[PDB]
Amino acid sequence: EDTPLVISKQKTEVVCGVPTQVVCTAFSSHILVVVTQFGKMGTLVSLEPSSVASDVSKPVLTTKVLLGQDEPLIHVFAKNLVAFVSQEAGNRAVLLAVAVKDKSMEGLKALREVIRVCQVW
Amino acid sequence: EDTPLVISKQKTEVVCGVPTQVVCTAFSSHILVVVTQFGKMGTLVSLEPSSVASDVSKPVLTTKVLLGQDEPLIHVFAKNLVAFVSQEAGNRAVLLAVAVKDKSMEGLKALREVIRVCQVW
Ligand SMILES: [K+]
Ligand SMILES: [K+]
C-alpha cells in the first residue's frame, strides 16, 4: 500500500502518430509536467511568472532552458504548451521536461489535450 | 486503462519523523529522482557524469543547482544522496528535486533506502 503526498496523474496517448507519455505533478509552488517520446527526458524548461512588461494585466512567463540545447523555438513552444497550466494553477511556476522532436500546431493542440486529461490543479 | 512508456516507482515513507514521498523515473539518458516533504518541489540539481579529475577510474559527478537557492551544502548532499543511482544506472545523469530542510546522516541513509525501494534501473 501507499499514499502519495502530492497529486500526480499520467497518460500515454498517441500524438501525431507518436506514443507520448504525459505526467503532471502538483507541488505547492510548481507544476511538474513531463512530456516524453521515445523514452527520452528531452529539454528541461523552467517557466516562471515574472515582472510585468507592457501588459500589466498578467505576469510575464519567463523561460529558461535548464538542461538540453538552448535554442529559441523551445522557449516559444514551451510557453504555448503549458502557459495554461501556469495560469489555471494560480500563476504557478511550471517545470517542463519535453521530448518532442517533430512539432506542429496539430501536435501542440493534441499535447495540451493530454495535459488537460492529467490536470492536477 | 494506461501503459507507461517509462518505468516509474514511488513510495511515501517517514524519514526522521517527516513524511516523505520519493519518485524515481527512468529515461534513456537520465534518472529523475523526486524527494518531497511538505508538498514542496524544493531545489532542482543536475548531477552529470563528467571528465575525470585526479581519479581516472570513475567519472566526476558534477552538480549544478538549476532552481532554488544555490548554496554549497546541497551540492554535497545531493551527491551523497544519488551518486549510487547514477553509478548503478550505468553512469547515467540524474535530475534531483529535493525538498528536505533538516538534514542528517541518519536521514540521508533512510532517504537512500527509500530511493532503493523505488529502483527503476
Ligand atoms: K527528444
Ligand atoms: K523544502
Author numbering:
A (entry chain A), B (entry chain A): 2 to 122
Task: Please share text taken word for word from the publication where this structure appeared.
There is considerable evidence that the assembly of the eukaryotic 26S proteasome does not proceed spontaneously, but is mediated by several assembly chaperones. Recently reported knock-out experiments indicated that α4, α5, α6, and α7 form a core assembly intermediate as part of the initial process of α-ring assembly, which is supported by PAC3-PAC4. In summary, we produced structural insights into the functional mechanisms of the PAC3-PAC4 heterodimer as a molecular matchmaker underpinning the α4-α5-α6 subcomplex during α-ring formation.
In addition, we newly determined a 0.96-Å high-resolution trigonal structure of the PAC3 homodimer. The overall structure of the trigonal form was very similar to that of the tetragonal structure we have previously published, except for a loop comprised of residues 51–61, suggesting that it is mobile. Loop flexibility was also observed in the corresponding segment of the yeast ortholog Pba3 in its heterodimer with Pba4. Our nuclear magnetic resonance (NMR) relaxation data from the human PAC3 homodimer confirmed that the loop is indeed mobile and disordered in solution. Another model based on the 0.96-Å structure, model B, showed that the corresponding loop contacts α6. Apart from interactions involving this mobile loop, intermolecular contacts between the PAC3-PAC4 heterodimer and the proteasomal subunits are almost identical in the two models. Specifically, Ser55, Lys80, and Asn81 of PAC3 form hydrogen bonds or electrostatic interactions with Ser110, Asp94, and Arg96 of α6, respectively. There are also predicted hydrophobic interactions of Val61, Phe85, and Val77 in PAC3 with Phe87, Phe97, and Leu93 in α6. Therefore, despite the low sequence similarity, the overall interaction modes of the matchmaking chaperones with the proteasomal subunits appear to be conserved between humans and yeast. It is plausible that the conformational flexibility of the mobile 51–61 loop of PAC3, which carries the α6-contacting residues, contributes to the interaction adjustability.
